[PDB]
Symmetry: C3
Subunit: 244 residues, 3 copies
């Protein structure tokens, strides 16, 4: 509408990718037009997708979409957060070559933003709506994230199935978390510092911290804080080397 905001290569690429896909598979036209092409913005596309996935007789897509609208209005920074979350997927995963892929398909990405809505509702004292969302996400996306948990931006929830994040956990920016991960057990759950990779099935338990840029090997059981710039593996986890 005016100024630097008009530069939006991610949205423009997504719109191009949906145009080309509908051309290639016209039966998917209702899907791609309703989710992307008929949308006035990437924000609305992402809200709409997630409201559609979570929508139920119990609480309709429309109500979820209306509430998402209220959250964007109160949290204008969500425009950037969602784009860098998108960017994380694109940069960190060779499996998917389009910006549209996380928006349409990847439940990890849908669960992140669902949590962001739930967290805001929770903070506003709308705790039933926050628990409803937590419950719905746990059932549909298989991600159980307590609404009081704090998630940074550029988070990559890869595959996602089985993720459990406790009430007092904190995840900072540019973290990647695989499927089957527990951030579990006043302050009694983990603090994950920026740039961390958490591998498949890892359990990180207690009020401990995982230092910046560290890697948690698949299947690790982490019961003690991890220094920055190390790789840890094993049950129980031990430092096995350095990393950048």
């Amino acid at each position: 509408n005016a100024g630097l905001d008009q530069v939006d290569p991610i949205w423009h690429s997504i719109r191009a990718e949906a145009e080309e896909a509908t051309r290639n598979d016209p039966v998917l036209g209702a899907f791609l037009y309703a989710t992307i092409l008929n949308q006035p913005s990437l924000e609305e596309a992402v809200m709409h997708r997630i409201a559609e996935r979570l929508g139920h007789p119990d609480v309709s897509a429309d109500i979820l979409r209306q509430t998402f609208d209220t959250m964007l209005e109160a949290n204008p920074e969500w425009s950037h957060v969602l784009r860098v979350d998108i960017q994380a997927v694109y940069d960190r995963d060779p499996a998917y070559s389009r910006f549209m892929d996380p928006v349409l398909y990847l439940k990890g990405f849908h669960a992140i933003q669902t949590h962001r809505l739930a967290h805001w509702l929770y903070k506003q004292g709308r705790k039933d709506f926050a628990y409803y969302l937590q419950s719905r996400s746990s059932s549909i996306f298989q991600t159980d994230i307590h609404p009081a948990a704090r998630l940074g931006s550029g988070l990559f929830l890869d595959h996602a199935t089985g993720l459990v994040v406790g009430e007092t956990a904190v995840v900072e920016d540019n973290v990647s978390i695989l499927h089957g991960v527990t951030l579990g057990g006043g302050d009694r759950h983990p603090k994950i510092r920026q740039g961390v990779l958490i591998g498949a099935g890892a359990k990180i338990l207690g009020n401990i911290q995982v230092g910046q840029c560290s890697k948690i090997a698949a299947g690790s059981v982490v019961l003690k804080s991890v220094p920055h710039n190390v790789t840890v593996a094993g049950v129980p986890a031990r430092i096995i080397g350095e990393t950048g």
Copy 2:
């Protein structure tokens, strides 16, 4: 209606909690009135919620609700079981401060009672209905519990995602079981004695027993019977201390 049965602090608290929540977030009114406030009893509230979550074109909420009614009629003790299952959640989990939370939201609690219905159907020789329920629960609650499995009362299925319970398994009373747990492999699956805690991701395999009050650390692989009043951890599991 008469006598000691009229004392029902859990139901009364739930009804108060739903009244207050609808007041605080009126859009959730359809939900809270249909699930709690319009219900004549806690039994009906819990049946209704679970029938709504599992309801599908294939087999409707109403049919599931009618069958749940038949199960309560045959199994009048379910009134108590469901209340002590509720109580377990309230007592054992700091994350949720209301009795209504497991009833409305927590799939673990929904899966326990779904299993109870499936088990009864199985015993009655209604094995397709029991397998249908098992299948539905596995898909929606991510809990795969064979209908022939036997679950005690006051069970806390915390987070629940990925639970697998085999045909010959037995869980006694006051057990807590986290997400990602396998009770797996004549008698070929585990017997879990009363008061046991099973941590996230543990696999307990074979016709072995876990003694009363014992704890299974997150990520343990248990291939041999565990004595009462010990903590075990590791792959393979070893006793690491005593506990009460």
Copy 3:
């Protein structure tokens, strides 16, 4: 219709099993007639079930069923593949005594065939339809299988919850894979040779191979190729014995 194809003991047994079940529980009549008895073939029964489970407002059962039809037409060998996949379940699992059980109920079996459809679509350059299916299956069946992955016949996906299979993975024939398994990380994911059993929660990571007839113990973390005819266990996995 003519010749050796008329011999179809699996379909005939299924039809008998559905007739008997509807008799025993008539409320399940809509289900059993729509899924089995009104079907002209086992192929159509399996397509119909899976299209019903995956069907959504976003993309309807009918469209999924029409696309499944196109896949069978192009891939006539699916008739055999689906029967030997059925046979695998029947032979390898004591919990279920009917051929109809995997067809109606077991999400593992539904996810295998969903992948087969997604893979074909992917190869045809219908990558959005393939990703949509992958996404839907991940959400409903809790199986995340990249469409470029290659799965052999007679595969038994037992319990299935949490399965993650990467883009370059290969699974050969007569493999069994439990819940919670990762075949994860050019060629960067595992090659599983024929006759392998992969136990609950195992993670097999990298461009490594698991030799013919080998067993992967529950909870193993496999970072190096495994010889044929051995059992491996532990974090990290070590050979613990021979097997046939």
